[PDB]
Design a protein around this ligand. Sequence first.
Ligand SMILES: [Mg+2]
Ligand SMILES: [Mg+2]
Ligand SMILES: [Mg+2]
Ligand SMILES: [Mg+2]
Ligand SMILES: [Mg+2]
Ligand SMILES: [Mg+2]
Ligand SMILES: [Mg+2]
Lengths: 67, 145, 141, 107, 141, 63, 80, 70, 206
Amino acid sequence: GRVRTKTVKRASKALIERYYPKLTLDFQTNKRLCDEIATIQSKRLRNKIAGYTTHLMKRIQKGPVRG
Amino acid sequence: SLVVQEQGSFQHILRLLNTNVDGNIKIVYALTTIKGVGRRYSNLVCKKADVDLHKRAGELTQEELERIVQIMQNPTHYKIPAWFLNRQNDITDGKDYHTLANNVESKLRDDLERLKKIRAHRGIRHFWGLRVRGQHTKTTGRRRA
Amino acid sequence: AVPSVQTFGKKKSATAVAHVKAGKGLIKVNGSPITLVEPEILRFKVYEPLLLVGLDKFSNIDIRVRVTGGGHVSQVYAIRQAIAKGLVAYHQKYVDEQSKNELKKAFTSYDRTLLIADSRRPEPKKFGGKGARSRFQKSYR
Amino acid sequence: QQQQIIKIRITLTSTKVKQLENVSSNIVKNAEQHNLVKKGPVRLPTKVLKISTRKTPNGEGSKTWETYEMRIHKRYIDLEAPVQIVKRITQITIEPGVDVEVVVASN
Amino acid sequence: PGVSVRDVAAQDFINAYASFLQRQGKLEVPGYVDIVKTSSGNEMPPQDAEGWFYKRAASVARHIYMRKQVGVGKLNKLYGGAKSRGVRPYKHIDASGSINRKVLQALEKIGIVEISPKGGRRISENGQRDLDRIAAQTLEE
Amino acid sequence: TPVTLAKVIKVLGRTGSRGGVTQVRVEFLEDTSRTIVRNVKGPVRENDILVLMESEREARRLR
Amino acid sequence: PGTIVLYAERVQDRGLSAVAQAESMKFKLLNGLAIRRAAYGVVRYVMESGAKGCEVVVSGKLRAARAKAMKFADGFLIHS
Amino acid sequence: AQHAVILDQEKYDRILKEVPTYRYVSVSVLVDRLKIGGSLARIALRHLEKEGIIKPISKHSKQAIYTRAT
Amino acid sequence: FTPVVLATPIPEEVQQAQTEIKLFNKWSFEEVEVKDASLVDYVQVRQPIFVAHTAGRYANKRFRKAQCPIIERLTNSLMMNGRNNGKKLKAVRIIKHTLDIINVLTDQNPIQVVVDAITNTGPREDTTRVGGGGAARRQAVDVSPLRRVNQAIALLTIGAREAAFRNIKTIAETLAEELINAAKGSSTSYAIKKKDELERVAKSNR
RNA sequence: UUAAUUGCGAUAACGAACGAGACCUUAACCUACUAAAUAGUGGUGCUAGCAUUUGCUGGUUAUCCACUUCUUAGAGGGACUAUCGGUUUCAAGCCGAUGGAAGUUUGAGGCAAUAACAGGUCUGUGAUGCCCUUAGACGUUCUGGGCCGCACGCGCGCUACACUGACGGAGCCAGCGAGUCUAACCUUGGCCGAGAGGUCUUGGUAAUCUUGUGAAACUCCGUCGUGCUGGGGAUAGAGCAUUGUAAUUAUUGCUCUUCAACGAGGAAUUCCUAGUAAGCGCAAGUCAUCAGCUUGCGUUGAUUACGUCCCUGCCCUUUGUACACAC
RNA sequence: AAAAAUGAUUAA
Ligand SMILES: [Mg+2]
Ligand SMILES: [Mg+2]
Ligand SMILES: [Mg+2]
Ligand SMILES: [Mg+2]
Ligand SMILES: [Mg+2]
Ligand SMILES: [Mg+2]
Ligand SMILES: [Mg+2]
C-alpha cells in the first residue's frame, strides 16, 4: 500500500501553512523548493513530502481542505 | 550405410568360455555376458582381434571367434598393458592374470578362504556376512545383509 | 574519422558491445558472421532485428559485436538487443530521426527487449533453504 | 637526486571511505598546486570480506545464519616528482585507519 | 574471396580438417590409442577407434588458432567433463593430459603449432596457411 | 448438443469453502435479456463468453 | 623500542560513555552499595551529562535464588 | 517383443514393397510397422534416402522425418 | 523477392522471411481464425512469433498469460517432470519436430491443428468439492475460457508425455499424433477422453 | 483504509514515547560528471601473420596516440504511485491505462518494542555461585582402542528407475570467492605417465597470476533400440598413487573385474507465486586428507493462482466461563 | 446442525 505516514502528512501540512504562495502545482519545483524551505535527512523522504504537498495543493485548488 | 543382405548363415545363441553368448547383440556387448570380461575388456579384445565392431556377434566366423577366445585367455601375449587386467600380481605366483567366466567365482572363493584361514579381520567379516569395506551398519543393508 | 557509434545490450549477466559504423553490410559476432550464431534453434532470435526492419538499410552499415558473460541464451539476447540499440543509435547520430522512429516502432511493436534490458534480477538465497524462496523440508515427530 | 624524476606510485587502503577520500583529495590538491601531471586516483573494486556464522553459541534453535562484512577500499595514484617534494607529501596527509604505501616504479 | 576459419561452422570444419589429416599421413597416432579412454570422467573409449585422434587434432588446431596461446592444462580442462561418481553427484574432471600433450607434439612435428614464447602452443605459419586452405575448400565444398 | 453461449456483464463475488468458485452475472448472445447467475471454476474477467451444457439453473451460495 | 608510543588523554563528557558508566556501576556493586541506588545514580549522572536517554539493566539473582532482571530508564531510547 | 536386427531377403523385399505409400517415414514407424530394430531402422532409412525413394523434410539427430518422394 | 547483395552472405531461405513473420520460417499465422467462439482473445495467434522461445514476463499479472502465443504456452508446458525442468531449447526443438510431423501426416497448417486440438479439448463443465460431512460431494460448475485453454494444454502435454514414456516412439511423434487426434475428436486421444470423463462426472453431479 | 495502532477521521480526552514507517546495505537506470597498463575500445598510428580491391588476428602506454559505450568507484541525479481515466462517508485510499530503467513498501535483506519461557548452552570463554574431586587425581600428558560397532524403528539427503535418455566425438558460455616469506598457499607452462599423479620451472601478498577459474546442465553430429537393456551402480575381488608419524575397522583418488534392489513408490507428508519453483554446476566454511552437508554464487528456466477462511493457525472487537499450573 | 474421549502428585 501507499498510505503516507504522519511525518509526511504533518511536514506537508506545515509546508502548506508556511509557503503556500511560493509552492507550485508540480512535483519538480516543489521538490526543488523543499531543498531550502526544509531540511530532510533523505532524498526519499523529501520526495515523499513534496509529492504529498503537491497532492494537497491539487486538492486545495479545487475547493478548500479541512485542517 | 551398407545394407548387406545375408543368407541363413546367422549364428544364433553360441558358446564361448562355457557361457551362452546370444546373437542379435553387438559383439562387444555380447561378450560382456562372460564373467570376468566387461565392456572395456571386451572392446579391447575385439579391436585386438581385428574384427569389425558392427557384427552383432552372429556373423562372427569360427576362426575369428577362436581368435577372440585366445586373446581373452592370453591378454599379455597380444599387447595388453597389464594394468587393464583382472588379476595383476597375485598372491600365488605374482604374474599378471585375468580371470574368466568360471574362474572369477572360484578365485573369489579361494581368496576369501585364504583370509578366513589366516583369521584376518576382512575374512572374519566375510564369514559373518557383514560389510568389509568399513561402511556403517547401523541403518543401511538391513533386509538382506 | 569514420562515423561510428558504440552501444551495448544486457541480459541477466551477459553484455554485448556493438560497434556500428559505415561499411558494406558486415554483421559479425565475436569475429564470426551472424549466420553462425549458436544455438541454431535460437539463431533467428539474433536474426530478428534484421528480418523486421529489413536488410535494405544494413547495406551502408556494418556491425561488430563482442559479447561476454552469462550463458548461451543470455548471450544471444544480449546480441540481438545490442544490434537493435546500435541501429537506433547510428540512425539518431548520423541520420534523420523519422527513420529512427520507424525503427523504434518496428522493434517495440514486436518485442520490448529489443531496446530495453529485462529488469528481472536474481533474488539472493536465504539460509534455511536451497533457493531464494524454497526452504528445507520440515519434519515433525 | 640531481632534481630528476623518480616515477613514484602511492597506494591508499582503508576501511573508512570518507577518511580515505579526504587523503586522496589532499594528495591530488598538493599535486596540481605544485603543478604535477599525473594519473588520477584509480579506484580498485571494493573488497567485501565475509564470515557466515551460526548466531547461537550452542547448537539449539532455528538454524539462523549471520554474515559480517568488512569493506576494503583501495586507490592508487601514479606520480612523478623530485625527492624534496615526494618526501614533503609523504610526511603529511595521513589519517588513522588509512594505510599508505609508496613504491618506486621501474616499468 | 578472403576468408579465415571464422566464417565456417565449427563442427563441419573440424570434420573436414580431421578427414584431411586422416587422408594425409604426416600426423602420427601415438600407439597407446586402442586402449585409452581419453578422460577419467569418461567410462568408454571413443566410439571412432580409427579417427578420434585426428578429430582431436583438428579441434586442438582450430582452438589454438582462435586463441593467442593455449597449453596442455587448458586443453585438459576444455575437453574434460562431468564424471558420474556412483551414488554421488557429478563434478568436473579434466581430460587426458598425455593425449593432449601427444596431439600437441604431433601438431608441432607436422608444423601446425610452435613454441609460443608466452608459454604455450600458438598457431604457426604453415598451420595458419593450410588451416585457411581447409576453411576455403570447406566453404567451396 | 444444445450448448449455449453467455457473456459475463457483472462479477458478483467469490464462493466456495476455499473460495475456488466465482459467481458471475451473464446475459445471452442471441437474447440480451435472459440474464442468469452462474458459478465458474477458473479466473474470469468482464466480457467473457461461457459455454453451458445446461442453460436453466440458478447458481447458489449467494450473499 | 621507539616504534611503539602510548599516550593517555582525558575523556571529555564522561557521563556519555557507556563503558565508563558500566565500570563505575560494577565497582559500586563490588563495594556493596544498593543495586537500585547505584543504577539510578548512574542514570541520573548520564542524564545530567546531557544524554537524550539512559537505560540500565541488572540481570541475575537479586535477594533470592530465582533470577530476575531489573530495568531502569529515563528520557528516550530508540531500538531499531 | 522381438525385432529382427539382421535383414534377410524377405524382409528386404517387404521393406522395399511397403515403405512407399507411408505418409510419415521415421525410425519409430519403421520399427512399429516392420519388426526391425532401431539401428537397422536407422541404416535402412539412410539407404532409402540414399537411393532417393523417400525424401527428408528435417534432418536432425534422434529425430529423422521423411515422406514420400516427389 | 529481389534479394539484396550483402557483405555478409545471408541465405535466400531467410531472405524470404523478410516478407512476413513465419514460425520456424515455415508456417504462417495468417488465416488461422480460431473457430470455436468463447475462446478468442485467449488463444493468441494474432501477433506472429518467429520462434516459440522468448523471455517474456507473463506471470506478474492475473490474465497476462493470455497474450503469450499459444505455441510458446505449449512449449512451456513440455518442460515438466523434474528432469526436463528448464531445457526450453529441447522443448522448442520438440515443438518444431512435432509440427513438421503434423504437417507430414496432414496437408494442413500445424498451428491450425494445435488450436483445433485445444478448442476440442477445453473442458466446458467441471466439478468442485463441497460439503463438510464425512462424505464430501461434488458440485457442478462452469469453466472459464482461460482455464479451458490451460487444461487443454495440460491434458495434451500430459498425454504426449505418458505415451512417450517407455516406448520407441519419440516425444515429438506422440505429441503429433495426440494433437492430430484431438484436432478432430476421436475418443482415442488422451485429452479428449479425459475431458469426456470430466464432463460426464459433471453431468452425474449436476 | 493500509503490509502496518498506516492514516482519514470520530472523540473525556489532551499532548507524547517505543515499535511500524522512516533509516542502512545490496540489486537494477544513468551515453550526466571525475578518471583509469592493476579495466577496456578505437586509430591497426607501429611493425606484422593468414587469405584477398578488406576481412580475421599477433605483439599494442617505456613502441604510440587518443577515449570512457561496456568494467571499476567517488560525488550526484532518478520514483514522489508522476500524469490521465474511474470509484470512495468523494478524505485517507484503491483499480486500470500512458510514460519511464524501475509503479506488491520497485526486489531482497540488515536493524527491530513491552512482557515472557524454569526453552538451549556450566562441553566457547582465565563469565561464574554452590557442591564434589585434587597426587594410585574427575588435574595433565603418552600408547592403544571407541565415538563408525548391527535382528531393528525414525528424520535430513544423494543417486536412480531411462529414448524429454545413456554413451562417443565436437561445439562451447557464468557469477560469488580464496590464495605463501614468522613457510610452502593458489598454481600457469614444459617434460613423464592410461589414469590418479610425478618432476623441472614460472607468476601471484593479488582488478596485475592462478583465471576468460573455456563449470555443469545445455547444443550439434553419431553408437544404442524399449530387452533390468549399452538404464542403475549397490556389494565385492585384484592392482596403481596421493595426505599423513601412522590409512587395518578398507582417508581419498585411479584402472580392470562383479553388476544387487530399483520399472515412479500405501497410508501419510514438505516447500513454493517470477528470474520464483525446479534442473545444473561453481566458490567459500569446516580442511594435512576427506562432501552425498552448509553458506553464497551464477546458468537454464515452467505450470498454476492473484483467491478464501474449508483445514492448520495469527490479529482486533464483542460475548460466556465453575479456567489463572490458564482446555 | 456428520464424528471429535482423555491428560497422575507437588511445585507463584
Ligand atoms: Mg566443457
Ligand atoms: Mg589419547
Ligand atoms: Mg557421530
Ligand atoms: Mg569475471
Ligand atoms: Mg575424516
Ligand atoms: Mg570444500
Ligand atoms: Mg555439518
